Curated annotation (Swiss-Prot), chains A, B, C, D:
Entry GO MF terms: carbohydrate binding; metal ion binding
Outcome, altering E92V: In minor form
Organism: Arachis hypogaea
Presence of keyword Signal: yes
Name the UniProt record assigns to this protein: Galactose-binding lectin
Cytoplasm found in the keyword field: no
Length: 232, 232, 232, 232
């Protein structure tokens, strides 16, 4: 099999294994801060530099993967805690959409919420323009921030949140488990065919954004990942 | 929400939180050895002592859970490395079946391979009587050791294996991710309705067994668990 | 390390982790009401259902523990605001004393004020028979409601009180910090050798009582707990 | 009674309620980073600007206090994770010792490890000149870094550690409870006569230091405090 695995206990902005896009900044404690606090419509994205072959057009096999990460979102005075973080998967040439409005597009889609990526959002602001649930929520997005499926959640300012993700290739099921700060766990699962939605080679990463009047601290603290593709 | 959570980084004799059934022994290093290498048809089981309420007849909700543990199986001179470990979920009254032959029943089934439980097995011996695949394998068992779904695998003597299971209550999906010592991961997923196969209160634990001639070391090294039921 | 920890932000009817004894009620809000307002000499107690092993007889170790909870007492028309709440530790077989008069026994002692427990009381009525100080008070009780030590305090009808307690195994010091409504803190500390007054396995919980004439609302709103026993 | 109370969820540089001394800096996420990873004998300290009256001259009364704070220490590549953090109480005119060597003096003592203060350390490096135990430990310092009493502990890089301190005036008892990332708790308590060791008015705070070769990220994330002095 073809296995790809890495693990970041802390990041740095001079590492060739990480692509930075937008307002991304690495702090002295090793955390990655995706948005710029005093910047209007800020957008920041981080991507594992190396593309991962998630499927083969030769065999027809699709990879299974397991990945976990921890983030922190914190309020800043006089600003609406918005807009959220999104763990996404996209073609290897992915870029911040041209003329991005940041805000509720999460840095992955255009104005009407479309784009080419599959992902899991931790949305903290309800945009009715994207059919947002009326509360903080966790959602499964397939080429659009108009979530295929959402689950009410609760973002607690200043808390370290841990996430564990499993995609089983045979059932093509993507399931998510969020351990909150009060101990409670939140899960959400959805069947997504990666082969049909994405190309053979892709890039995984995180993206956060905000608007004018809607901003908050978006930090990524750690990240480990392992994918395995059977070559037979 | 109703949450149950715990974490064992080692075990000790006399902790009211754990129930021991059969040939279980607590090693001086904090590990739990499931079977007796000197007994024929050995069976050892360990359970979280408190029943967990997995679904409510009042509301109709089903809990979601995330649990992870790691184990090790090691070969012993002269005996066939058999038969394996199984993480299971059973009614509150659960006990080692009456006339257990151990062996391929894994300590949770009768002689024909039937019982009342839902569980994940790590089978190191192929029993044609239970329709086992020809190689070591990981399997999803619903009231039978004749697995509803299996996936090839390879037990390595002395290797520590780490496992992650996520049960998403809404899709009723149970997913597993196994991390071999070599780095490659193994996954298997299956929709299993817990509300349909089990009582409101259940118990969680691990079971292992052997035969005459089929024997090996079965160790549980750690276990963490968290379940959350959306209360009324 | 052998650790037990739990967190109840709210309570629910039917949870396997909570034992109710006497006049206990779970309100629609998740709060627990310890006494019945229409009953003479009412008593209600709520306990963490699992026995916790506080000291080991193998090694000579006693566990340290940190617990916090919040309660509220509130006046009811025409009745004297009595008698108070008590957070206690008792042998795992603990039960409301046979033919209990409620009142100043706080539901944990007998008519003479004796019993088998260690506890911190939030006493709202002065019982000269148990040598109560003349004002409301916080007391440390060792097998009796005639406190080993008390400190004046003031109960505010409808106020949410927060309490933190730390037991340090090495010195044997039980420390209590009470945070009133007006922000003021009240403290009390006492050396109590738990290994000499209690059995290895105990249960933790809250008890409240009233009499004819003496009645008020007794609520438990939350409770978190963590104990760690050095096993080695 | 005279009560002083505050609660910080994040700190800012333009805050006159806090005194910054030494290499201290405030990150964009609101954390206080006590040391400079680039400086050789970095020393950083942060003090609550307002002096607290811990005891009275008229009445021999001492104050009781309850305080809780969280921190995070993390390793940096090519440097020994040293030297630790210390919560301390000292004269209102306190300043970093002249010609401070950082290191094992924790920024509160001179070269022989002497000074005027009373504190709780989370020492991550073993200095024999100050008779340090051989492992990571928590200690009670009374005018010296050669602890009056210590307890073994473990500092986990990247982990958020919460602490709770209660000082009870009547028993003159200081006790601490540390919650590792693990769920496990460590406690330590000691009888310190605050009126015999410190002046009427004092300042509360934290300090951290490093050496050449010994350096790590030392952060303070939050801090709440309350103290009450009976003036009768
Ligand atoms: Ca949105
Ligand atoms: Ca078998
Ligand atoms: Ca009384
Ligand atoms: Ca030191
Ligand atoms: Mn959304
Ligand atoms: Mn099988
Ligand atoms: Mn009393
Ligand atoms: Mn020291």
């Amino acid at each position: 099999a073809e296995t790809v695995s890495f693990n970041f206990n802390s990041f740095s902005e001079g590492n060739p294994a990480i692509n930075f896009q937008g307002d991304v900044t690495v702090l002295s404690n090793g955390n990655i801060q995706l948005t710029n606090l005093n910047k209007v419509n800020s957008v920041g994205r981080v991507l594992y530099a190396m593309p991962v072959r998630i499927w083969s057009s030769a065999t027809g096999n699709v990879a299974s993967f397991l990945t976990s990460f921890s983030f922190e979102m914190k309020d800043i005075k006089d600003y609406d805690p918005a807009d959220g973080i999104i763990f996404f998967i996209a073609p290897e040439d992915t870029q911040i959409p041209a003329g991005s409005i940041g805000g509720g597009t999460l840095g992955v889609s255009d104005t009407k919420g479309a784009g080419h990526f599959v992902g899991v959002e931790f949305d903290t602001y309800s945009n009715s323009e994207y059919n947002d649930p009326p509360t903080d929520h966790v959602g499964i997005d397939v080429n659009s921030v108009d979530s295929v499926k959402t689950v009410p959640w609760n973002s607690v300012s200043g808390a370290v949140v841990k996430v564990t993700v499993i995609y089983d290739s045979s059932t093509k099921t993507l399931s998510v488990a969020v351990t909150n700060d009060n101990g409670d766990i939140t899960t959400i699962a959805q069947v997504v065919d990666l082969k049909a939605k994405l190309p053979e080679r892709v890039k995984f990463g995180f993206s956060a954004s905000g608007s004018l009047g809607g901003r908050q601290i978006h930090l990524i603290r750690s990240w480990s990942f392992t994918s395995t593709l059977i070559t037979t």
